[PDB]
């Protein structure tokens, strides 16, 4: 029920850390998965020229 101007207590901050770390881990780990998709897309359509 608090905002950042008022300030959070220990329990609320501890609760928010779960979502913070989940988002950070997802961002760190999907980089290695998008590159595989773009590599496969380039491999399948390398030679198509007008």
């Amino acid at each position: 029920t608090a905002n950042f101007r008022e300030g959070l207590n220990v329990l609320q901050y501890f609760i928010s850390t779960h979502g913070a770390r989940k988002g950070l881990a997802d961002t760190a780990l999907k980089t290695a998965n998008s590159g595989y998709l773009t590599r496969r897309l380039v491999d399948v359509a390398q030679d198509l020229v007008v």
């Binding site: 220990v10 329990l11 501890f14 850390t17 913070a20 770390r21 988002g23 881990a25 780990l29 380039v42």
Partner: protein
């Protein structure tokens, strides 16, 4: 009451909640672990005692002799920590171990004691830990990181229906020992149990049961109960219990004892069961078809025929019932099974299991474990015995035994270290009970299942690993019978143990060079927890669930400070108050609540214990006697939080900083920052570089002193006293008389570290913070280390900052910096670099270090002394000579041309070739230190003698201080004795001290006392001469170097780096940026008084990042600077002390019921003036991370200093003088300089060296390499259509050997054209493919 160090400058505190438990020593986790490893233990439970007892005694096959361990001992180290760092050797102690070889006679009861020989042997060196929790390995400080691993015991888990497409879950159990073989039990989609040994081919689960001498009847009895059907001439009447009928539907009309409880087609209800229990139904009438599918348990044989009728665990039929009916077998035992529970999994697995004996199971186990070889009965038996039931190949440790007993609901805690039959039976029964929906699986990420392992335990494990190998060697060498002459010393070789210890302490994954950016870096490094390492996880096969924040992390692991990237969630920081059990589990302290009254009792609870209580938050109001003001308080109960009544509270938190780590507790207004930016700020705060002068934060949290003192970078008084001598390099303290030991001169000497290189090529320098003659007490700070200011951590500088856009120069996190910042050297840093020159020995003669290089001019040799080494204090640049060296080129045939050369020019120029050490290109600095290491037996040059003389002078002075004190005391005694009788007074004063020994008195004690005093004086002189000789011998000892190495010379260069655009700056709230422009002073915005700002930051970076702590910090820093300005104005115009102390008391009294009380009435005028002098640059302020200052308090402090309450003022443009249209937030922030300098980043290349194989440019700035043009860049060029750019990048720039030369020539000639060829890498590929036996070739 305040200490001397704190009373000089008191930091105002806005905290409101009293402290009940002080912050503990921050390095206990390392010190306690190593002390436990090293200390003598009467019991064999920890350390070297456990390792020695776990192997010894060692007995030979014959049994006629054995070796017995008695005790061990650690000798004194040869050198000190500082001496080891200077010389570059390991700081270690020798291990002396007492062994006893005992011999036994033959043909006698037991073993007759023929001969016992006891000898103390040398086992090797053991590295020691310093006072700060580090190890000096090869002269460099190192840290061993603790590991968070999986606890030994038994664990039950399941898959979430992922392995089977039907969405059916499969359960499993696993037994994890400390050392041994794994044992797994698992289910299959067919409800059959299976057993896996060390992750190998699956086996039926009854093989292990049959390997333990178990009959099928016994197995059925263990895993199933019995139901008795009796032939009573009424269609096999059965003995039945009503509860058995629950969960079933009536097959027919259920009537017993003349009462129809249930009818056919009607399910049995609970009321029917209760009626059956009330009537005590025992006899039933069922049809002969009731045993159509029932399973018989035991074996029944007809006594007449004498043959088996039905085998054990077989389904009966009507014909079998008839067969047993004619034989008159009135007892049939079936197995009570159902569908809701009591599954037949054991019986079905038994039916599927092929073996039905005790010997074939061992054969199958041996074949599975060791295929490809024929089986053997003895081999299989030995393998099975040594797999799980041998103390020398399997150990379920004390913690493993405790966890095993806890998981099975046992009562005892202690036990054996090996498995038994009953343990496996209990594990199987528990797994079956889980399968029948009568239990729960375990949580792997729960902190009660993860354990902490520190350096002492790892060292013990490695020592045992070496010890077992030494034991094997001893047993192999003990077969020969020579007990009449052999000794234990010749039996054991210390090479394997010492090699293993060195390997662990030097090249382990968890042993790293200590991070030495600042004291916070070291504190953070020593308190780090890792899930990686030997026996841990990998960053590519970890998973998301192990990287998450768990509820059990509360108060034990910081939920914020973790690296971002591949290692997120795998590297953690210990919380402030966290500890470990004796078993290695994290625990946190709480205050006990009794009858609604909060007491001062502190209990450390672990994760398992914590979940069974209702624990209140630390943000809970309390009365004066300890009563909750409200009636409903917020509490966590079972992994979740809610409101509870006042009488349901069990415990409360001890502090509001219990949840966070040391690094996160240093961020002010942390509760106003988003968690992502808090993580970024915590990570960036420990990579700041120290500057020329330290500056305290001026807005802190109260943890600065603890970090500064516990890091060990400062000089702390060991005993109280008075400063007798103070200097820029040494401090001498005269100890108080009540803290002195008998018969000593009470003085303490502190030698400060001056301009020393760190592990990150930075500067380590100490400066005194005490004056000549002032009192000190134990624990006071005598000298500040790097990034320390009067005993407080000082990582950055205070900067006057405005939040506004300025002509696009702070666009996208750019920073605009004033020129006055550069002119004041506020962010200038010192960097120290080391270079080495090695002179070896060749076959044609040895290399010589000399100043007589024949091919160089006189100017280049001007900076070298007579020994060929550069002077101290010389400014050198790229290509200058540091150490001159020549290499013997060797003898020749001396042809007439060579004879002419030798005759005309000389002989020195014809025998040696220059191999000097020179400054690398792009490097400069000042020579500040030179070290010379010489092999023992080689003559030293003059430079080494000068260094040794300088090193001897310091020790001589240190000894002279104590010698002078003692001799002054003794001569005072002599004068006191001599005056009493034959007093000369002035005449005695005229004579020198030495003449007093010649003067005598009568034959009374007036002469015996003088003789005793003279003897004591001579003894003192002899003792100090012996001390000086010992120090000289230690100093002059030679250096042991690598084979074929004669001398080593090390030169240290120092440079100063100034701030410039392209350098990275940051705050403590995750607000980083790069300098874009240095602005002249008259262009900066200024206020009504003409004062400009130092930094301009973009306000657009705040709202989206949600790091609001920086705005509040800016406002509070403005207020603190205003208070300091008032104090400075009062000091400038000399006023009375009364007004100063009145104003300072008013400033310290501000706040709403704060817990800090400062009273200046107990301060003297001198102390008040000193404090006021220290406060004239601003009053420092502390705000704890969840008990900080409110906005109203900040506004009150602003009002006290006569500043606008909004925190915003009017500014004027420096270039036009026009006022900006809106008020701007102006204040003070704490900025840091990060170790990302554009001097180390910029790199360019035209042409250079190439690889020998691929013929392509090298990589790295150190090799002057090129940039990589990878596949994505090629794709971008293909998408553009730039074919010529791509071809030029692929051939004439990388590996077209002729094309490179032709392109260079054409470019120089002014013709921009290329002639591409074939890359060399394609030729290499063709050759490599041909080497595989494949014919690949080019066509046409």
């Amino acid at each position: 009451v305040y200490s001397y160090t704190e009373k000089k400058r008191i930091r105002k505190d806005f905290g409101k909640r009293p402290q009940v438990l002080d912050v503990p020593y921050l390095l206990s986790i390392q010190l306690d672990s190593f002390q436990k490893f090293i200390e003598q233990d009467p019991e064999g439970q920890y350390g070297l005692e456990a390792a020695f007892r776990s192997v010894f005694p060692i007995q030979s096959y014959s049994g006629n002799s054995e070796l017995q361990y008695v005790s061990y001992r650690l000798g004194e180290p040869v050198f000190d920590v500082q001496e080891c760092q200077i010389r570059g050797v390991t700081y270690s102690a020798p291990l002396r171990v007492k062994l006893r070889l005992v011999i036994y006679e033959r043909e006698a009861p037991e073993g007759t004691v023929k001969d016992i020989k006891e000898q103390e042997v040398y086992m090797g060196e053991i590295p020691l830990m310093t006072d700060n929790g580090t190890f000096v390995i090869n002269g460099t400080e190192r840290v061993i990181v603790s590991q968070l691993h999986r606890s030994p015991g038994v664990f039950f888990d399941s898959d979430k229906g992922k392995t089977h497409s039907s969405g059916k879950v499969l359960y499993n159990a696993r037994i994890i020992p400390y050392r041994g073989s794994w044992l797994d039990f698992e289910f299959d989609p067919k409800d059959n149990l299976f057993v896996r040994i060390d992750r190998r081919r699956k086996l039926p689960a009854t093989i292990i049961l049959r390997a333990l001498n178990y009959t099928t009847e016994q197995i059925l009895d263990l895993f199933f109960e019995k139901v008795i059907f009796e032939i009573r001439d009424n269609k096999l009447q059965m003995e039945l219990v009503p509860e058995r009928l629950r969960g079933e539907t009536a097959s027919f009309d259920i009537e017993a004892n003349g009462k129809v409880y249930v009818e056919k087609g009607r399910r049995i209800t609970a009321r029917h069961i209760r009626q059956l229990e009330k009537d005590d139904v025992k006899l039933i009438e069922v049809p002969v078809e009731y045993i159509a599918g029932k399973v018989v348990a035991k074996d029944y044989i007809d006594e007449s025929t004498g043959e088996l009728i039905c085998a054990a665990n077989m389904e009966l039929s009507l014909d079998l019932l008839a067969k047993l009916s004619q034989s008159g077998h009135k007892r049939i035992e079936t197995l009570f099974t159902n569908d809701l529970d009591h599954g037949p999994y054991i019986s079905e697995t038994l039916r599927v299991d092929p073996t039905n004996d005790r010997l074939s199971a061992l054969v199958e186990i041996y074949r599975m474990m060791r295929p490809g070889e024929p089986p053997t009965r003895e081999a299989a038996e030995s393998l099975f015995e040594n797999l799980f039931f041998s103390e020398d190949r399997y150990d379920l440790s004390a913690v493993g035994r405790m966890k095993f007993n806890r998981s099975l609901l046992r009562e005892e805690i202690e036990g054996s270290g090996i498995l038994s039959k009953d343990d496996i039976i209990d594990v199987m029964k528990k797994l079956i009970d889980i399968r029948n929906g009568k239990g729960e699986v375990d949580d792997i990420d729960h902190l009660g299942n993860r354990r902490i392992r520190s350096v002492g335990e790892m060292a013990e494990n490695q020592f045992r690993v070496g010890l077992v190998r030494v034991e094997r060697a001893v047993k192999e060498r003990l077969s020969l019978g020579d007990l009449d002459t052999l000794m234990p010393q010749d039996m054991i070789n210390a090479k394997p143990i010492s090699a293993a210890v060195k390997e662990f302490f030097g090249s382990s994954q968890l042993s790293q060079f200590m991070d030495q950016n600042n004291p916070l870096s070291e504190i953070t490094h020593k308190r780090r927890i890792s899930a990686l390492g030997p026996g841990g996880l990998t960053r590519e096969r970890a998973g998301f669930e192990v990287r998450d924040v768990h509820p059990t992390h509360y108060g034990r692991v910081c939920p914020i400070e973790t690296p971002e990237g591949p290692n997120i969630g795998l590297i953690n920081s210990l919380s402030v108050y966290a500890q470990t059990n004796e078993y290695g589990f994290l625990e946190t302290p709480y205050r006990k609540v009794t009858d609604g009254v909060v007491t001062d009792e502190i209990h450390y609870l672990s994760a398992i214990e914590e979940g069974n209580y209702v624990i209140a938050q630390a943000n809970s109001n309390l009365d004066e006697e300890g009563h909750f003001v409200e009636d409903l308080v917020t509490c966590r109960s079972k992994g979740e939080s809610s409101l509870f009544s006042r009488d349901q509270v069990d415990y409360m938190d001890v502090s509001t900083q219990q949840v966070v780590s040391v690094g996160a507790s240093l961020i002010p207004f942390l509760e106003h920052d988003d968690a992502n930016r808090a993580l970024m700020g915590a990570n960036m705060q420990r990579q700041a570089v120290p500057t020329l002068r330290a500056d305290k934060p001026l807005v802190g949290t109260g943890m600065e002193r603890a970090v500064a003192v516990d890091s060990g970078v400062t000089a702390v008084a060991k005993r109280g006293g008075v400063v007798q001598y103070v200097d820029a390099s040494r401090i001498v303290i005269k100890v108080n008389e009540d803290e002195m030991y008998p018969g000593e001169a009470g003085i303490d000497i502190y030698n400060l570290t001056k301009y020393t290189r760190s592990n990150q090529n930075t500067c380590i320098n100490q400066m005194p913070c005490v004056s000549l003659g002032e009192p000190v007490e134990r624990g006071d700070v005598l000298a500040d280390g790097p990034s320390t200011d009067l005993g407080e951590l000082a990582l950055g500088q205070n900067m006057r900052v405005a939040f506004m856009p300025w002509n696009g120069y702070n666009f996208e996190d750019s920073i605009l910096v004033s020129e006055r910042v550069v002119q004041e050297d506020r962010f200038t840093t010192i960097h120290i670099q080391e270079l080495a020159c090695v002179s070896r020995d060749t076959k044609l003669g040895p290399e010589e270090i000399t100043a007589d290089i024949p091919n160089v001019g006189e100017a280049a040799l001007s900076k070298l002394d007579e020994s060929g080494i550069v002077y101290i204090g010389a400014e050198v640049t790229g290509g200058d000579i540091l150490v001159g060296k020549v290499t013997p080129k060797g003898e020749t045939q001396l042809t007439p041309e060579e004879k002419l050369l030798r005759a005309i020019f000389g002989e020195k120029a014809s025998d040696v070739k220059d191999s000097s050490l020179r400054v690398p290109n792009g490097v400069s600095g000042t020579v500040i230190d030179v070290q010379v290491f010489t092999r023992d037996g080689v003559e030293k040059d003059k430079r080494a003698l000068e260094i040794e003389e300088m090193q001897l002078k310091q020790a001589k002075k240190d000894l002279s201080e104590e010698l002078q004190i003692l001799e002054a005391g003794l001569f005072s005694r002599i004068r006191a004795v001599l005056v009493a009788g034959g007093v000369e007074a002035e005449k005695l004063d005229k004579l020198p001290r030495d003449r007093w020994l010649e003067l005598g008195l009568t034959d009374e004690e007036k002469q015996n006392q003088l003789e005793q005093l003279a003897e004591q004086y001579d003894e003192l002189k002899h003792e100090f001469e012996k001390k000086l000789e010992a120090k000289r011998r230690k100093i002059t000892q030679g250096d042991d170097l690598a084979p074929g190495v004669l001398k080593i010379v090390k030169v240290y260069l120092a440079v100063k780096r100034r701030i410039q655009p392209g350098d990275k700056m940051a705050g403590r709230h995750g607000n980083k940026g790069v300098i874009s422009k240095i602005n002249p002073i008259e262009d900066m915005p200024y206020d009504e008084n003409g004062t400009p700002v130092d930094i301009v930051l973009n306000p657009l970076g705040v709202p989206s990042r949600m790091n609001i702590g920086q705005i509040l910090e800016t406002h509070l820093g403005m207020a603190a600077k205003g208070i300091g300005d008032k104090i400075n104005a009062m000091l400038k115009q000399q006023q009375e002390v009364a007004k100063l102390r009145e104003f300072i008391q008013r400033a310290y009294d501000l706040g709403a019921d704060v817990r800090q009380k400062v009273d200046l009435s107990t301060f003297s005028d001198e102390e008040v003036m000193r404090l006021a002098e220290n406060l004239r640059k601003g009053m420092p302020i502390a705000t704890p991370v969840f008990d900080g200052a409110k906005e109203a308090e900040i506004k009150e402090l602003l009002k006290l200093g006569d500043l606008p309450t909004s925190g915003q003022i009017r500014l004027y443009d420096g270039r036009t003088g026009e006022q900006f249209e809106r008020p701007v937030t102006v204040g003070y922030m704490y900025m840091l300089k990060l170790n990302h300098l554009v001097d180390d980043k910029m790199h360019a290349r035209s042409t250079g060296s190439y690889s020998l194989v691929t013929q392509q440019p090298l990589g790295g700035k150190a090799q002057f390499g090129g940039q990589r043009f990878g596949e994505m860049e090629v794709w971008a060029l293909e998408a553009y259509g730039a074919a010529y750019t791509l071809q030029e990048m692929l051939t004439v720039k990388s590996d077209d050997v002729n094309g490179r030369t032709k392109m260079y020539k054409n470019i120089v000639d002014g013709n921009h054209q290329m002639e591409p060829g074939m890359p060399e890498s394609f030729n290499v590929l063709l050759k490599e493919i041909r080497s595989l036996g494949i014919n690949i070739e080019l066509e046409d």
